[PDB]
Amino acid sequence: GAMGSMERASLIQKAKLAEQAERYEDMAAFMKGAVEKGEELSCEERNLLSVAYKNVVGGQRAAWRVLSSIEQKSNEEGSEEKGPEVREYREKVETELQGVCDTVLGLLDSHLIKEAGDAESRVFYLKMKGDYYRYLAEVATGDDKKRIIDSARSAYQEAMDISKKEMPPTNPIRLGLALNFSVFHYEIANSPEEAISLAKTTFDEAMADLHTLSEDSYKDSTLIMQLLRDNLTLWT
Amino acid sequence: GAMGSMERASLIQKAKLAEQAERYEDMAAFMKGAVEKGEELSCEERNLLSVAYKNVVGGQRAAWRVLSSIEQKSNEEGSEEKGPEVREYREKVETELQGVCDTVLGLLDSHLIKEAGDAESRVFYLKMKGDYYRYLAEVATGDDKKRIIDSARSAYQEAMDISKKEMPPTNPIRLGLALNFSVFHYEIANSPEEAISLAKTTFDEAMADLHTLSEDSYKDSTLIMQLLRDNLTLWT
Numbered sequence A, B: 001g002a003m004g005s006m007e008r009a010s011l012i013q014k015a016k017l018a019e020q021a022e023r024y025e026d027m028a029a030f031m032k033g034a035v036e037k038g039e040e041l042s043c044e045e046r047n048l049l050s051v052a053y054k055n056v057v058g059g060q061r062a063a064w065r066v067l068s069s070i071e072q073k074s075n076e077e078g079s080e081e082k083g084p085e086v087r088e089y090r091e092k093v094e095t096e097l098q099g100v101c102d103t104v105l106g107l108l109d110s111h112l113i114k115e116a117g118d119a120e121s122r123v124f125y126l127k128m129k130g131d132y133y134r135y136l137a138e139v140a141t142g143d144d145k146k147r148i149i150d151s152a153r154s155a156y157q158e159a160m161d162i163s164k165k166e167m168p169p170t171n172p173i174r175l176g177l178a179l180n181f182s183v184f185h186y187e188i189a190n191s192p193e194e195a196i197s198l199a200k201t202t203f204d205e206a207m208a209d210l211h212t213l214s215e216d217s218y219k220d221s222t223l224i225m226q227l228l229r230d231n232l233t234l235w236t
Helices: A008-020 A024-035 A043-074 A085-115 A119-139 A145-166 A172-188 A192-207 A215-235 B008-020 B024-035 B043-074 B085-115 B119-139 B145-166 B172-188 B192-207 B215-235
Strands: none
Touching: A008 A024, A008 A043, A008 B043, A008 B085, A024 A043, A024 A085, A043 A085, A043 A119, A043 B008, A085 A119, A085 B008, A119 A145, A119 A172, A145 A172, A172 A192, A172 A215, A192 A215, B008 B024, B008 B043, B024 B043, B024 B085, B043 B085, B043 B119, B085 B119, B119 B145, B119 B172, B145 B172, B172 B192, B172 B215, B192 B215
């Protein structure tokens, strides 16, 4: 790996610089190098890893949606034949997106998840596993689409089971997991009622636990609760 | 070149798709491939080339400025020694920026400028040559900084000489050239009075020619005139 000669601490320092410079591909490469040093990641380091790849894949997803929309309009009755270029370029972006997802899933499998014993780390990584399988599902169309969907579901479900046993209902990781699993239900699994039920129950159980929190924790939790509420407003 | 097997028309089509998807690195690679087919570029194609590279280098410049600011704060009295990482990463971004500038300058030299005979194409490419030498000057610190600055100045000056002979004072290419040369004077050449004089004269001569224009051309010209006015307001 091109980061193999750089100190772990230097990779983390440069990931933070890359974030400040909005250089998310660099940020992700630095964090991949840091993971590949083989040591577990601190909470701060896990968040750097997630921010970097979420930004990279987010740009790819947005581009893929633009191109997929153009491609779909091209196959509508009365559209002129423009040749293979739209499909080819959509496929190019798709393959790059899949490659990033495979890279993240590879880091999680080798060996972040298996060494993660604390609830906060294990839930974080299993949520990430669900997210990156979800991104693969968004572009899947062939035989394996059902298996990709089931992989996302299984990762999210294991994360949910741990989070419900080991974390309070206001914990921001637990809340973000529930948010993303509800989006999985709505957008991927064709289960809008499950999505709505999960978002509602998560919101209500968090609301009931806010009284236990400091001002700063209250701010953190209510921010994510508002995202649950925003989705409920859109979906109902 | 990786684009050598793709049809010219397909490269242009994909450049337009990449623009819609905000995939500017892809856009630039497609347009580089199109240039390397060896045919002259139409007005639309020249603008695709410029948009692509301006976006790529613009992101690099913004990142370089963030990192350079952090590096300068690190060398201020009482700042802790953080090691070589800030300098290293600033240098990495700088080298990538220089590489993009060298790529654009290489396309202009081989062989866009020498085949450009019409004023609109020749001025466009010489303005680009000035711009990319200007971006190199922004990061230059060694022996060649004076020579880089003079290369930018010479390209802009040749473009100005042609534009004044061959184009009306409201022509948007002429206006954008004057805008950028005035920025060169202010930011690069330590000549704020020259910058102000150029922006003022350009604005006033365009104003006097607006009466000759259609509604659509008037909109195009006045948009750039407002940019000249914005700089004058900042500089005076």
